[PDB]
Amino acid sequence: SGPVPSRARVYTDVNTHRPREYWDYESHVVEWGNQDDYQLVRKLGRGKYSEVFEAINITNNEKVAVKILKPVKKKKIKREIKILENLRGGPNIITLADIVKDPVSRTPALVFEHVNNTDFKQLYQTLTDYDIRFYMYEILKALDYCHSMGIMHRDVKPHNVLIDHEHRKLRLIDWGLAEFYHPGQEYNVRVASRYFKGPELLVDYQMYDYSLDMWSLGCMLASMIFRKEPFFHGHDNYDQLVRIAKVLGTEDLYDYIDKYNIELDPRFNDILGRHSRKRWERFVHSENQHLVSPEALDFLDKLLRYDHQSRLTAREAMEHPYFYTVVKDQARMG
Ligand SMILES: Nc1ncnc2c1ncn2[C@@H]1O[C@H](COP(=O)(O)OP(=O)(O)NP(=O)(O)O)[C@@H](O)[C@H]1O
Ligand SMILES: [Cl-]
Ligand SMILES: [Cl-]
Ligand SMILES: [Cl-]
């Protein structure tokens, strides 16, 4: 009589229907490239698990990007490599062009297509309402694609979305926490960034699915339309669920837990208490009111729901009328 099972509403068996080797990434054998074929130009930044550099492919002088992984188990390296290989060709996902080793460290050096080192998080200040819709749809293409190829990103956040605003091109990056979805598998909840974690991770519900990403995307949307960064600003893991409950109310939270018979720390129950559902209009101010339309609020509602199985899928999100006009975009660069 543990917690109740769950299987994804969409793309449930896509990995099942594929050959083993599609998803059995521990078995993958990396083909190494020519390390003397890429020379680093300059440092573009970093992350908790990589150094990213602009570089050049010398055999044709083409511009690339090179992510040098810090040390770390080969299990994950093969997982990120296989995923990136599987997704190559998909809309708006970063293209893996080679893997080589760092000359001195001998660690893997992932060659990608070059983008601008400019992300969605940098552009929060300036985006018109049309542009928020537009880029949101571009991210959805990536999620729908990855989810349909059996893959959960599990780290959707503005830092992980590169935008070339000049060319109106977005790529979803940082697949290092991505995993393959298998109905009935339990996944670690130490995925994603505090502010973008679904209530499932926050209550240790491990039989989660692609719909985690859809919560994270809702959280990104909310910060952008309300100009509050982040939107749910939890100071620790438990406080993250308390902040969500202060907006979305506790009655549905407690209905979600008893839906899936999840075991919550009694003492943490006491901390949550009872919070009434705030109407999404509470966070409208003069400074953000031009970003907030009824279709925006309806879309967010359908994303920010405690029950992972209730949230819009990427495809259903793509059909939502928040994207009615922007799908007709006439592709003006300037
Ligand atoms: N293909 C790329 N083109 C340009 N910049 C990139 C590219 N990939 C990553 N970066 C840059 O790296 C900096 C930090 O990105 P980061 O999230 O570290 O990417 P990552 O290479 O996936 N690293 P990690 O988080 O360790 O996996 C940002 O300024 C990004 O612009
Ligand atoms: Cl971020
Ligand atoms: Cl995992
Ligand atoms: Cl989906």
- CATH number, residue 282: 1.10.510.10
C-alpha distances out from residue 232 to 227, 270, 308, Å: 12, 20, 17
Domain count, the chain: 2
157 shares a domain with 54: no
| CA nearest ligand 1 atom 5, residue | 117
The answer to whether residue 247 is domain-embedded is yes
Residue with tokens 């979600």: 256
CA nearest neighbour of 97 among 47, 148, 57: 57
Ligand minimally distant from the alpha carbon of residue 208:
3
C-alpha distances out from residue 28 to 68, 80, 153, 249, Å: 19, 11, 20, 45
Pocket test for ligand 1, best of 52, 119, 163 (most atoms within 8 A of CB): 52
| CA nearest ligand 1 atom 29, residue | 117
Distance in angstroms (rounded) separating the CA atoms of residues 136 and 210: 17
Q: Which residues form the domain of 280?
A: 6-23+115-330
Pocket test for ligand 1, best of 44, 80, 153, 160 (most atoms within 8 A of CB): 44
Task: Please answer whether residues 221 and 229 qualify as being in contact, where contact means their C-beta atoms are separated by less than 8 angstroms.
Answer: no
CATH number, domain of 54, equals 3.30.200.20
| CA nearest ligand 1 atom 21, residue | 67
Could you give the residue numbers annotated as active site? Answer: 155
30 shares a domain with 13: no
Task: Please answer whether residues 191 and 210 qualify as being in contact, where contact means their C-beta atoms are separated by less than 8 angstroms.
Answer: no
Distance in angstroms (rounded) separating the CA atoms of residues 23 and 19: 8
| Domain-terminating residue out of 65, 95, 114 | 114
CA of 179 to the centre of ligand 3 (A): 6
| Domain-terminating residue out of 73, 97, 114 | 114
302 shares a domain with 217: yes
Q: What resolution in angstroms, rounded to 1 decimal?
A: 1.7
| Domain-terminating residue out of 114, 144, 178 | 114
Distance in angstroms (rounded) separating the CA atoms of residues 32 and 99: 6
Distance in angstroms (rounded) separating the CA atoms of residues 61 and 96: 18
| CA nearest ligand 1 atom 19, residue | 174
The answer to whether residue 49 is domain-embedded is yes
- The minimum-distance atom of ligand 1 relative to the CA of 116 is 4
**Which residue type, as a one-letter code, is found at position 145?**
Y
Give the method used. X-ray
The answer to whether residue 162 is domain-embedded is yes
C-alpha distances out from residue 38 to 64, 76, 102, 168, 187, Å: 8, 24, 10, 27, 36
Distance in angstroms (rounded) separating the CA atoms of residues 56 and 186: 41
138 shares a domain with 68: no
Q: Which stretches of the chain are DSSP H helices?
A: 14-17, 20-23, 74-87, 120-123, 129-148, 199-202, 211-226, 237-248, 251-259, 266-272, 294-303, 314-319
Pocket test for ligand 1, best of 173, 193, 196 (most atoms within 8 A of CB): 173
The three-state secondary structure class of 73 is coil
Q: In the structure, which protein residues have their CB atom closer than 6 angstroms to any atom of ligand 1?
A: 44-50, 52, 65, 67, 94, 112, 114-115, 117, 159, 162, 173-174, 176
- The minimum-distance atom of ligand 1 relative to the CA of 47 is 18
37 shares a domain with 167: no
125 shares a domain with 97: no
256 shares a domain with 324: yes
DSSP annotation of 31 reads -
List beta partners, residue 56.
39, 63
